[PDB]
Amino acid sequence: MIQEQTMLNVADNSGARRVMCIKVLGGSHRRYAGVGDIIKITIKEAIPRGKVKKGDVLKAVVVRTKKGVRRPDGSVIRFDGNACVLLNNNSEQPIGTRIFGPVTRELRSEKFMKIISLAPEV
Amino acid sequence: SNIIKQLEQEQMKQDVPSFRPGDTVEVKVWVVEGSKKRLQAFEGVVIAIRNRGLHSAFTVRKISNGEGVERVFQTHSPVVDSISVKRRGAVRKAKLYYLRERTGKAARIKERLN
Amino acid sequence: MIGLVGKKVGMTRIFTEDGVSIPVTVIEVEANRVTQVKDLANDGYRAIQVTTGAKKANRVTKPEAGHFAKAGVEAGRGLWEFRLAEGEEFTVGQSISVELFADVKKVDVTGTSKGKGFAGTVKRWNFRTQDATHGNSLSHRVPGSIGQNQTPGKVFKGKKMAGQMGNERVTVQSLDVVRVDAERNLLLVKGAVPGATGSDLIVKPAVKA
Amino acid sequence: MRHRKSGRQLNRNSSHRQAMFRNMAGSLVRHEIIKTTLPKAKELRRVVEPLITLAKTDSVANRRLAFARTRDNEIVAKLFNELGPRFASRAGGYTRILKCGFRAGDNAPMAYIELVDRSE
Amino acid sequence: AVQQNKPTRSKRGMRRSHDALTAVTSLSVDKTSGEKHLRHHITADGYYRGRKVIAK
Amino acid sequence: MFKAF
RNA sequence: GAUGUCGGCUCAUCACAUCCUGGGGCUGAAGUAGGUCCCAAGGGUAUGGCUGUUCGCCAUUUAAAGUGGUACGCGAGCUGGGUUUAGAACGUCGUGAGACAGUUCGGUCCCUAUCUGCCGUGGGCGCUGGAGAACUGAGGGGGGCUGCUCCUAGUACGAGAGGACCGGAGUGGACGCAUCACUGGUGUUCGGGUUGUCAUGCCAAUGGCACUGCCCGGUAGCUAAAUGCGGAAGAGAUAAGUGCUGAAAGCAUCUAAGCACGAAACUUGCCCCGAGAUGAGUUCUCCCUGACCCUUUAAGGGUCCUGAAGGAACGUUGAAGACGACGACGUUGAUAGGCCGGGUGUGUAAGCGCAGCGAUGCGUUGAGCUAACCGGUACUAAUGAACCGUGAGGCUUAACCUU
RNA sequence: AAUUCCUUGUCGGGUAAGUUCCGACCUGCACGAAUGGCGUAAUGAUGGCCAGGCUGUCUCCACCCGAGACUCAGUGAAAUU
RNA sequence: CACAGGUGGUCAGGUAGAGAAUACCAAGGCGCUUGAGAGAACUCGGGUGAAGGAACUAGGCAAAAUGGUGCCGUAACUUC
RNA sequence: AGGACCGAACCGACUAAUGUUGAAAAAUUAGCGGAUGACUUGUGGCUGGGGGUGAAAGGCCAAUCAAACCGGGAGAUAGCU
Ligand SMILES: [Mg+2]
Ligand SMILES: [Mg+2]
Ligand SMILES: [Mg+2]
Ligand SMILES: [Mg+2]
Ligand SMILES: [Mg+2]
Ligand SMILES: [Mg+2]
Ligand SMILES: [Mg+2]
Ligand SMILES: [Mg+2]
Ligand SMILES: [Mg+2]
Ligand SMILES: [Mg+2]
Ligand SMILES: [Mg+2]
Ligand SMILES: [Mg+2]
Ligand SMILES: [Mg+2]
Ligand SMILES: [Mg+2]
Ligand SMILES: [Mg+2]
Ligand SMILES: [Mg+2]
Ligand SMILES: [Mg+2]
Ligand SMILES: [Mg+2]
Ligand SMILES: [Mg+2]
Ligand SMILES: [Mg+2]
Ligand SMILES: [Mg+2]
Ligand SMILES: [Mg+2]
Ligand SMILES: [Mg+2]
Ligand SMILES: [Mg+2]
Ligand SMILES: [Mg+2]
Ligand SMILES: [Mg+2]
Ligand SMILES: [Mg+2]
Ligand SMILES: [Mg+2]
Ligand SMILES: [Mg+2]
Ligand SMILES: [Mg+2]
Ligand SMILES: [Mg+2]
Ligand SMILES: [Mg+2]
Ligand SMILES: [Mg+2]
């Protein structure tokens, strides 16, 4: 469950360290963004000489959440923190060339094949 | 509730091994990637177990690639193929939620040498 | 189409080879005996009245006992009626089992919902609560305004207000029939249904189709 | 809501409620018949009767358990020495409640609660 | 918060129409003691269902 | 007592 | 001899001069996407930064973030930031007291609801013998939103770029209903750890108090963040509109006669209430088959005998409940408690022994304890009765059964 | 600016977005030198603004423990009319 | 008013504590002059909370949070 | 040493909630300020109404203050209701 003002870590090497969600896209009065949901974010902290800079407004896909993900059999997968992967604003493609930490299988879609291929785990 | 008991009983797994909280358990879970089926291992520390007959479940915690992960396995679900106890831990509590605040040396669990 | 009267045994989980978990409500549908048949010439509509279960004969009233004796049936928990279609026909004393739904994929389940008693507007109508701080005085979850001053000078009919919640007839539509087990008089339907465990339940084929 | 809940609050807090029944339980054991309000008598069954069952088998651990729930060695001795042996054959239902009208002071409904084997 | 007109004798009477008390339907008689008592209640001298449950 | 200046 | 302001909050309701969705006519309408006009009010019709602000600007969304009425809706519902009491200061005006839709800092928001209205829930009586059930449905209410992806099809169209109508499928947002099987919350009524102190003679072991002393977990129940379902198809009559045939008016003409099509509007379809529907309905069972007496001799009154079906009361109670009500049960009995077994939760009790100087560890031992849960069991309490309710049910006419 | 009407002046900083805030400019409607001017360490239940921590303030409320509300018995008001 | 108000001196036990704070107690004195049930909305006083963490609001109002001893260490600006 | 520091008694009254026919005609609860001083407090005394007193709010002078209270002029006057 990611809302506005939620702080998320960055699971890619795009240069951003943590970001602020400023809008949950995909509907009207939509308030929760789970794993695999595109969110509009603003970079709050970034490393120097990165490909993104503080204050940039982009969009990202949630890949890990504390609330976890529900499986068809009822099993739940949870993570110690919330993470997201920054995506190009126009083409919605990942900016970083690597993915950090485990990834969840709800991203098994045509547009997120890049993330899974680079995912260290599943 | 005799009817409910019988309905659940006929679909309970009989090969479930005996394990306790603090035990390092490796679980084989069926995973499908396209048409082909596959097995992947999720090894971690059992931090919580609920016994509810067919609805029994247990929580396994592990640190993968620097990120802590917790999986709540439905023990009787066909998705989980097998359960194996790699190590036996000695703890005084049924639930080990306090391990969420610890890592590295502080998260060590003493082995149970009965 | 005709339905049957069952009892809510409870809720249960059904596993499948593919690894999916199906939440199912277990409904016990014993033999439904036809106690009376309604005819157009005599009653003005076509329907069958059926009874299910059994009750102690000591507490059966004389007029109730006489009605069951007419159809040669043992007194049940109660009496329910089902409307008949054009081709349907039944006879007094006939027994209908859970196999009727063997060829049915979706069903309609109706029953009395759990009684919440006197409920406030927040619970009953999902009214938004007012500020818990910032000067609020004894108005944290009160309904608030209920009118528009002199022009109407009244409260309109149907205004949402606190009152009795639940304990009323409720119908849930298009519930999948996971399994029909005739040998034990059981009917497993995906999802939850109104009422607490052991409450009377009426199951009909899905009218919505 | 109060669905499938047990235990009367009796317009008291948990600490006061627990202490009151501890005293009342000892009174019923000390005096085999006592007079109290009907709702209080109904709750007293769920406290005194388990003590009698606990006294069915005599042991140091059981006596200490009885002491922790009564905090009066006189009652503990009474339960294990007399009440326990007397109710050795009864499968529950060690107490009986009889209604005795209403209290004059506040019109509260009153009822006697007594051990079933008070006959002498 | 307060009335704009004085309610009448009539309005007071109708409100009190539901205030009437109901007398006890009947008093049970002990099988042996023979005196009247409330049903499911002991008698004056401690009898109930024919047994002297209370000594006094 | 409210006021309307 | 008082009708309390702006804005916010909560809760709304109506209009249609329609913002989105729906149906159309023109288009300087190729397609996609627009422009303009007509019909349409069923549903839906952003979160934030700044500001007391409405407004407005800006950021990012959305199918769209409609315009208005309702005392510029709503303070006996909340707020009191702005204006508009008394304090104080700035600029400014005045010799001065003081003044300023100039600006600054601070500054008591009372009311237990009689009536109307509304949301719930009962009592009485009626419905023409009484009683127990199941119904018909006049009428009324609820519900009516919509995105994206895929196929059709890279087809129609277009030089290209670009890119469909019409029909299908899948999966979402918001909203609504139900429920706890699952994932979780709560769980001061279940276990365990621990600080200070007091007490049970003391050790050991326990209890009281300190917010449940502070904490860690947790049964049932309730519950959402949890997981099931819902909006519709179809039908009838239509709006704008498009037509067929066709005269008045030899032609033409959708219209005058006569036919056809046509939208989230309308009447139905789906869900709930519903015979106080006084127009009080229908169907099926159950119960009552005695004496007399009086005159104001009539739907008359009264005594005796009788007390049915059924109801109520009382008692044990409920996943029913403010109280009523409603459901279960009362010995020919599992209604509640206890009891027995089991399952849960907590996590190896106490006692004793063994190691250690000791704290402590180990064995007995996954032990002990275990609330509301599950399957059982008359051990306790649900009494033999009393009480209410009667004794064949008006007149008139019609059609039958008849003598 | 406790002073600026025009005015949310203009530029810069902070924010994804700042009528407030900070820095600067001077076009001071209508600052100004003991009815004191400009600075100032420390101090302030003082005014404005930002950040970390923190959380039911909020998204969006859920459950629980108590005192009322509700029922019974006793006593028994009030404004208003 | 048998009113949660106001009213100056003197006496000053135990354990923990720096303490006349605070907690539990001694001597001593009390349970506050309506009770009994129920366990609805709502109000009051509190406890807990998934994910987020000021998005609330005129304003972080209120809550939450920090909290003690030693020792290490501690910037600008300073009238030192 | 200190109108020094932290903090009870003690003296104050910044915030919130409750209460507002209140328990109370100004309080309660949780926080809050000072707490060796321009401190606080007991008993007694002095200042009297166009006067007192006032670290100055037109504050206070017996629940009354832009001129106290009591009695009198007095049946002031009222083109008003
Ligand atoms: Mg107030
Ligand atoms: Mg409040
Ligand atoms: Mg009003
Ligand atoms: Mg009118
Ligand atoms: Mg009480
Ligand atoms: Mg306590
Ligand atoms: Mg007037
Ligand atoms: Mg319609
Ligand atoms: Mg706005
Ligand atoms: Mg207005
Ligand atoms: Mg103000
Ligand atoms: Mg002034
Ligand atoms: Mg003015
Ligand atoms: Mg000891
Ligand atoms: Mg801010
Ligand atoms: Mg400036
Ligand atoms: Mg000046
Ligand atoms: Mg000061
Ligand atoms: Mg009373
Ligand atoms: Mg008193
Ligand atoms: Mg003290
Ligand atoms: Mg309560
Ligand atoms: Mg939380
Ligand atoms: Mg806001
Ligand atoms: Mg605060
Ligand atoms: Mg606090
Ligand atoms: Mg000092
Ligand atoms: Mg105070
Ligand atoms: Mg101090
Ligand atoms: Mg002044
Ligand atoms: Mg005074
Ligand atoms: Mg004169
Ligand atoms: Mg005069």
The token pair that represents C118 in the structure block: 């006197």
Phi first, then psi: give them for residue B108, nearest 5 degrees. Answer: -65, 145
C-alpha D106 – ligand 5 centre gap (Å): 12
DSSP element (H, E) containing C13? strand C4-15
Residue ranges per structural domain of chain C: 1-209
Q: Tell me the CA end-to-end span of chain D in Å, nearest whole number.
A: 47
DSSP characters for E7-51?
Answer: --HHHHHHHGGG------S--EE-TTT--EE-TTB--TTSEETTE
Say how far apart CA A24 and CA A30 lie, in whole Å.
Answer: 6
Contacts of D55 (CB under 8 A, 6+ apart): D62, D66, D79, D80, D83, D84
Place of tokens 């042991």: D59
Say how far apart CA C146 and CA C149 lie, in whole Å.
Answer: 9
The token pair that represents C147 in the structure block: 């009118």
Chains C and B, touching by 3 or more CB pairs within 8 angstroms? yes
Question: For residue A30, what are the domain limits?
Answer: 1-122
Q: Is D23 left (phi over 0), alpha (psi -120 to 50) or beta?
A: alpha
DSSP element (H, E) containing D93? none
Exposed, middle or buried: residue C82 (CB in 10 Å: 0-12, 13-18, 19+)?
buried
Q: D13-116, what's its fold?
A: 50s Ribosomal Protein L17; Chain: A, (3.90.1030)
- Number of domains chain B contains: 1
Phi first, then psi: give them for residue A41, nearest 5 degrees. Answer: -130, 160
Say how far apart CA C177 and CA C204 lie, in whole Å.
Answer: 11
Q: Tell me the CA end-to-end span of chain A in Å, nearest whole number.
A: 21
- Number of domains chain A contains: 1
DSSP characters for C131-165?
Answer: -SSTT--S-SS-------STTT-SPPTT---SEEE
Q: How many residues does chain E have?
A: 56
Say how far apart CA D59 and CA D75 lie, in whole Å.
Answer: 15
Cβ-defined contact of A73 to B77 (cutoff 8 Å): yes
The distance of D48 to chain E (nearest Cα, Å) reads: 20
The distance of D102 to chain E (nearest Cα, Å) reads: 10
Rounded CA–C1' distance between F1 and G103, in angstroms: 30
Cβ-defined contact of B78 to C15 (cutoff 8 Å): yes
Cβ-contact C26, B4 below 8 angstroms? yes
SS3 A120: coil
Chain C positions touching A73 (Cβ under 8 A) are: 15, 19-21
Cβ-contact C22, C14 below 8 angstroms? yes
Contacts of B53 (CB under 8 A, 6+ apart): B5, B8, B9, B12
Rounded CA–C1' distance between C132 and G51, in angstroms: 25
- How far is it between the farthest Cα atoms of chain F? 13
CA of C105: how far to CAs of B54, C209, E6, in Å?
Answer: 26, 9, 67
Q: Which of residues 104-133 of C touch strand I (CB under 7 A)?
A: 117-123, 131, 133
Written as one letter, the residue type at A30 is R
For D79-115, b/e burial (b = at least 16 CB within 10 A) is bbeebbeebeeeeeebbbebbbeeeeeeeeebbbbbb
Cβ-defined contact of C19 to B77 (cutoff 8 Å): yes
C-alpha C15 – ligand 24 centre gap (Å): 47
- Angle, CA C130 vertex, CA C127 and CA C132 arms, to 5°: 135
Cβ-defined contact of A100 to B40 (cutoff 8 Å): no
Question: For residue B89, what are the domain limits?
Answer: 1-113
Establish if B9 touches chain A: CB-CB under 8 angstroms: no
Say how far apart CA C21 and CA A74 lie, in whole Å.
Answer: 7
SS3 D67: helix
CATH number at residue A26: 2.40.150.20
The distance of C116 to chain D (nearest Cα, Å) reads: 7
Cβ-contact C31, C185 below 8 angstroms? yes
- Angle, CA E27 vertex, CA E26 and CA E32 arms, to 5°: 145
Exposed, middle or buried: residue C94 (CB in 10 Å: 0-12, 13-18, 19+)?
middle
Q: Which residues pair with C95 in a beta bridge?
A: C33
Contacts of C33 (CB under 8 A, 6+ apart): C50, C51, C52, C71, C73, C74, C76, C93, C94, C95, C96
